[PDB]
């Protein structure tokens, strides 16, 4: 009965934390993508022109 809540708590603490941090990290991946992308597409299209 003790170990049950020990495991449940440890699991849910881990899983929630993982979700939260990955969620935050995503936005940064978005903004880095945006900045890479707009140049990459512009200058490649430009060359072929």
């Amino acid at each position: 009965k003790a170990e049950k809540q020990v495991t449940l708590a440890l699991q849910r603490q881990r899983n929630l934390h993982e979700d939260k941090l990955s969620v935050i990290e995503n936005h940064l991946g978005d903004l880095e993508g945006r900045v890479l992308a707009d140049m990459f597409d512009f200058l490649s299209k430009e060359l072929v022109r």
């Binding site: 512009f42 430009e46 022109r49």
Partner: protein, 165 residues
């Protein structure tokens, strides 16, 4: 823009260009153009570094057009071209005017009348001597040099700066 020199005057969406616009290309060519998806998507005219006009219609970012006109405004054909040839050996101004309005010796490609200065030739851009294999530009500086094939073409075809007989 900067990294090749391209230039544009028009509207931007998502940061990439979508426009009806005048435009400049790091040829220092000028253009007037419409855009989509950050690409040309237009019927547009390209104004040369030498001013003359090429035209470009754009399909999905590729070109499909034929028109040209010179910087003087001579209308041109890239094929069959009927100009100063078997139907009449008259230049653009001589066909438009007929006899040039006062008959100045520019009943010829360039005048008022002179000998070609250095020697050399006329081939319109440049002076070239078959005795020197050098072409020169009308500021009497220089132009691309030429061995036997082009030399022989100049020798037969065009007008030397021989002495005026």
């Amino acid at each position: 823009m900067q990294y090749t020199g391209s230039q544009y005057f028009g509207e931007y969406i998502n940061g990439r260009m979508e426009g009806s616009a005048e435009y400049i290309l790091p040829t220092d060519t000028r253009y007037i153009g419409e855009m989509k998806d950050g690409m040309f998507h237009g019927e547009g005219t390209l104004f040369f570094p030498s001013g003359s006009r090429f035209d470009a219609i754009w399909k999905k970012g590729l070109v499909v057009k034929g028109k040209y006109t010179f910087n003087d405004g001579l209308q041109y054909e890239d094929k069959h071209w009927h100009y100063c040839d078997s139907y009449d050996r008259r230049f653009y101004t001589e066909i438009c005017y007929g006899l040039k309005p006062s008959g100045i010796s520019q009943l010829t490609n360039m005048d008022p009348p002179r000998r070609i200065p250095l020697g050399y030739y006329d081939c319109g851009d440049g002076f070239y001597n078959p005795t020197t294999r050098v072409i020169k530009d009308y500021r009497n500086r220089f132009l691309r040099n030429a061995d036997d094939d082009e030399h022989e073409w100049i020798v037969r075809t065009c007008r030397k700066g021989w002495l005026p007989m």
